Structure 1
């Protein structure tokens, strides 16, 4: 599955529910320590709807367990993210992913 560790605590009461839209800031790097993506570089928060297979499984499962304003770290195994095919030219096959996620706003 996915492992979640808390960096900065959040509200602790509000959680993402069905039909809502999450606005997050994230940064993703490989297990070796090499960065491959960051939404703060583009200076625009990422927005996605939960339950509509818009993103990979691990990102959604990690974001489902976080409260409003929380900042945490997520780890995803290869069978959850891109499997054995990877992302051509970006992610090699059989890679474990590490994300640093902050939840900003809901809907």
Structure 2
């Protein structure tokens, strides 16, 4: 019951809002983005969490510093929004995968909370 937000519209990145954000603005290419996020494999039990690390996750949007899925997904989020993403291998680690923690052709699922985004 979720929204495809790929260009090719291959359902390679489905999205569902869970907590609606505030403001009309969204993060743009090159913005410095702040999030919290849980993240886990689809067919899988263990999760990775910024809450554990005790520090928010900070990256530059649109600049290929995270998986293709995140550059796409986060760019649709309003400040304070929480969203679920479900990602096909092509839009993450692909066939190669990333040992130790990402298998080959692994389908990922994330929860993200956009905290803030500022200009370069």
Answer whether TM exceeds 0.5 for this pair: yes
Count of aligned positions: 107
1:15: which partner in 2? 26
Which structure's residues are more often helix, by fraction?
2
> Which structure 1 segments of 5+ residues have no match?
none
- Tell me how far apart the structure 2 counterparts of residues 14 and 91 of structure 1 sit (CA, whole Å): 33
Q: Are 1:100 and 2:117 matched, yes or no? A: no
**What's the C-alpha RMSD, in Å, of the aligned pairs?**
1.2
CA separation in 1, counterparts of 2:43 and 2:52? 21
Corresponding residue to 2:91 among 76, 80, 83: 80
- TM-score with structure 1 setting the length: 0.93
Residue aligning to 1:45: 56
In structure 2, the gaps of 5 or more residues are 1-11
Question: Does the 8 Å CA contact 2:29/2:63 hold for their aligned counterparts?
Answer: no
Among residues 75, 81, 84, which one is paired with 1:70 in the alignment? 81
